[PDB]
Amino acid sequence: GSTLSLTTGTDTLTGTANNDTFVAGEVAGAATLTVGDTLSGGAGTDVLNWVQAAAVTALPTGVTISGIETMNVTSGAAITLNTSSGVTGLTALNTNTSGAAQTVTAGAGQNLTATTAAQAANNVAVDGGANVTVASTGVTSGTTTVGANSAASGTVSVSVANS
Amino acid sequence: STTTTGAIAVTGGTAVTVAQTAGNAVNTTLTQADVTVTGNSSTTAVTVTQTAAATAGATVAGRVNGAVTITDSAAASATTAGKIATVTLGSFGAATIDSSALTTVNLSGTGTSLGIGRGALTATPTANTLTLNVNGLTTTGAITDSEAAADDGFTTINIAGSTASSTIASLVAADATTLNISGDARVTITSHTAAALTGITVTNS
Ligand SMILES: [Ca+2]
Ligand SMILES: [Ca+2]
Ligand SMILES: [Ca+2]
Ligand SMILES: [Ca+2]
Ligand SMILES: [Ca+2]
Ligand SMILES: [Ca+2]
């Protein structure tokens, strides 16, 4: 497939209907998933990689992801996002912190995986989704909490390590 | 694609045909293209075919239909004739026709709504027979005679069902007088709104 790069602007990107991958990194340490960004996939080998130094805070205004099967979200700080709207066609959501909180809500039909290193006193909270997986290491005070607001369609699989 | 078919617009010609298809995969929905045809004063006929709508299933390719808008030249004129006589549809979303010369509409496949207006001719029309040939037609909503309400609609509607069953969710024809259902295969009208009707006459097999 083809490989498509988001900019610090408003992007209108449309995949090949093939193995295509969407990169939503940083530019000068400025985020590239930004207000009004609209992304479109085609055929079923579609990946969106969202990587940011800054905390993920929500999906930004007017952002719509469509036809993209896997969403990877990695932050140098906390993640808070909801993907029960704007996003359609998403089978797999993977969110990644190291040393800060997570507060994620997925749409049913989407398999959530919330991996967190060095959780410490930070709290993981996840909701909705199809199969959910929480993978937390270096844990300490942190609560882990699943489906407090909305249950999973499929299986829950928490695991938590403390030193 | 699953991304939707972008406009189609035509202006002018002796006869116009726009034939869309949809070939998307078995668990996806493609919504089809909005069509506009605007006749010039040579345009006798217009045809606008699409792929039939369906609900995205496990093994059912999903399709939504595009709006169609057909307009004759002399649609806004008080005096000029009008040339579009026949319109053929094969599936449709929110369809419109506007022609004072319109006599025949051919319907087919999966429809949302048809609104028929006649040109804003001020002259009182003498020939007021809508022939409406149906064949495998199914409608979400209404076939309306938009002209009948505040102006001079069709007095007699003829519906000829053909080779396959048809179902019109609603038929609204406020100036209609006679209604003759004819032909070859079942015509079902789930709900008519035709207050001035003096007779209905089925001749259909
Ligand atoms: Ca952007
Ligand atoms: Ca693709
Ligand atoms: Ca895709
Ligand atoms: Ca009128
Ligand atoms: Ca008039
Ligand atoms: Ca009237």
What does this molecule look like?
- It is classed as membrane protein.
- Keywords: S-layer, surface protein, membrane protein.
- This is part of a larger assembly, with two copies of chain A.
- By secondary structure, chain A is mainly beta.
- Chain A has strands at residues 3-5, 12-14, 21-24, 38-40, 47-52, 64-66, 70-75, 79-82, 92-98, 102-106, 111-117, 124-128, 132-136, 144-146, 156-160.
- The radius of gyration of chain A is 15 Å and the shape is globular.
- Chains A and B meet through loops of A and loops of B.
- Residues 1, 15-18, 20, 41-43, 46 of chain A line the site of one calcium ion.
Topology record:
The structure is cut from a larger assembly and holds 2 copies of chain A.
Chain A: E1 3-5, E2 12-14, E3 21-24, E4 38-40, E5 47-52, E6 64-66, E7 70-75, E8 79-82, E9 92-98, E10 102-106, E11 111-117, E12 124-128, E13 132-136, E14 144-146, E15 156-160
Parallel strand pairs in A: 1-3, 2-4, 3-5, 4-6, 5-7, 7-9, 8-10, 9-11, 10-12, 11-13, 12-14, 13-15
The structure holds calcium ion (6 copies).
One calcium ion is lined by residues 1, 15-18, 20, 41-43, 46 of chain A.
